[PDB]
Amino acid sequence: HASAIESIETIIVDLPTINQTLVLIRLRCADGIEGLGESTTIGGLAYGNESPDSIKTNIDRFVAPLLIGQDASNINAAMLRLEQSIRGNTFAKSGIESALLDAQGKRLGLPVSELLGGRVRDALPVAWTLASGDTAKDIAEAQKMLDLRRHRIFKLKIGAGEVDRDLAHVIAIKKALGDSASVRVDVNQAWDEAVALRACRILGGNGIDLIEQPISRNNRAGMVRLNASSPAPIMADESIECVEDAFNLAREGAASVFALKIAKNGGPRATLRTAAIAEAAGIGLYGGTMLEGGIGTLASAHAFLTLNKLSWDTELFGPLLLTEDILAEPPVYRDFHLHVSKAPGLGLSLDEERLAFFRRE
């Protein structure tokens, strides 16, 4: 009549942006406590093998049956029970663990960061992706975010256009901002090593601070070679699809910085194991996102608050892209940071009206 998991509801929500689809998880226990989680991805199946649609399918058909009736207060046991019968599906697992953590936090009256060991900071620096595709527009937007003291670290997505044009674009943005901001790029696996070996040298010699996943996660030997030739640090993102990938990447020397995404590792706890491996290997950390709304963003944040050091900051700006979220109170952003409260669990509540209005069904 207390901690037993009573029900797990998965809801697909479509929210307008400045459309983003989220998968909300509502986990309820026998004692009335409800935990909220979020499994969100980008562009259907273009950025991962799990879509919001298949996440709901697999949670409803396989995850729920395994957890209904289980003690929600033993999260390690619940997640291992899942790992025993379910391969992959890390996005789904991440949402489920987030919900369990939120519920256990409420149950003990402690924020998730404390359940995870204890925070060493209350705020996290938040970078911003400039996505207009227009050099002039990006520079203006960056200067705007700087003036409003919202962001001072900017990320540029490149790789889709002609290499020299992408490079000129990013370099022109850094040149305009100078030392007033940190400029990084994400190539999303777009380049072949033949192109990256030259492009990384150019970006590194022109003020770009970090080069995220320049080539395919499949060119394992190539990522190692690029770490040696690139004068700028390389960060692994897509190369990490589970905690074990983190170890293998560190063993091989495939990247000097690891992006930490709860969706890719299977939840905050799994993400902290990936962080532990990176730290033990002397690899830098970055708080990554799959553009989650407030729930997923805070689930990530609470884990990041416990890290000794986050040398490369975070990109937890997902909520800032939504013209409307399903939360009664959005996360707090001020002076270049995301400020995380000490409220129990994830410290957020659902706005039932907006949920009913935006839920696909």
**In the bound complex, what is the minimum distance in angstroms from residue 5's beta carbon to Mg ion?**
33
Nearest of 209, 164, 212 to residue 187 by alpha carbon: 212
**In the bound complex, what is the minimum distance in angstroms from residue 216's beta carbon to Mg ion?**
13
Task: Give the containing element (helix H, strand E) for 190.
Answer: none
Residues flagged as binding site: 186, 212, 237-238
Pick the catalytic residue from 157, 193, 279, 324. 157
By the criterion CB under 5 A, which residues form the site for Mg ion? 186, 212, 237
Instruction: Give the residue nearest to Mg ion (CB).
Output: 237
Residues facing residue 36 across a β-bridge: 26
Judged by beta carbon distances under 5 to 8 A according to partner kind, the member of Mg ion, a second copy, none in contact with residue 186 is: Mg ion
**In the bound complex, what is the minimum distance in angstroms from residue 279's beta carbon to a second copy?**
8
Query: Is residue 312 within 8 Å of 210, Cβ to Cβ?
Result: yes
Which residue type does 92 have?
A: A
Judged by beta carbon distances under 5 to 8 A according to partner kind, the member of Mg ion, a second copy, none in contact with residue 114 is: a second copy
**From CA 278, how far away is CA 83, in angstroms rounded?**
22
Find tokens 């990320």 and name the residue: 155
Residues facing residue 247 across a β-bridge: none
Q: Using the minimum distance from each CB to Mg ion, give the nearer residue, 102 or 186.
A: 186
Query: Is residue 40 within 8 Å of 290, Cβ to Cβ?
Result: yes
Q: Using the minimum distance from each CB to a second copy, give the nearer residue, 116 or 190.
A: 116
Judged by beta carbon distances under 5 to 8 A according to partner kind, the member of Mg ion, a second copy, none in contact with residue 216 is: none
**From CA 305, how far away is CA 291, in angstroms rounded?**
19
Coil/strand/helix, residue 16: coil
Residues facing residue 283 across a β-bridge: none
By the criterion CB under 8 A, which residues form the site for a second copy? 73-78, 80, 83, 108, 114, 116-120, 243-244, 246-247, 250-251, 269, 273, 276-277, 280-282, 306, 308
Pick the catalytic residue from 34, 38, 50, 315. 315
Q: Using the minimum distance from each CB to a second copy, give the nearer residue, 110 or 321.
A: 110
- The answer to whether 175 is a known catalytic residue is no
Query: Is residue 63 within 8 Å of 8, Cβ to Cβ?
Result: yes
**In the bound complex, what is the minimum distance in angstroms from residue 306's beta carbon to a second copy?**
5
Residues 6+ apart with CB under 8 A from 168: none
- The answer to whether 157 is a known catalytic residue is yes
**In the bound complex, what is the minimum distance in angstroms from residue 55's beta carbon to Mg ion?**
20
Judged by beta carbon distances under 5 to 8 A according to partner kind, the member of a second copy, Mg ion, none in contact with residue 237 is: Mg ion
Task: Give the containing element (helix H, strand E) for 176.
Answer: helix 163-177
Find tokens 């777009």 and name the residue: 190
Judged by beta carbon distances under 5 to 8 A according to partner kind, the member of a second copy, Mg ion, none in contact with residue 333 is: none
Strand pairing of 123-125 and 337-339? antiparallel
Residues flagged as binding site for Mg(2+): 186, 212, 237-238
Query: Is residue 346 within 8 Å of 105, Cβ to Cβ?
Result: yes
> How is residue 59 written in tokens?
């949670």
Q: Which residues are catalytic?
A: 157, 315
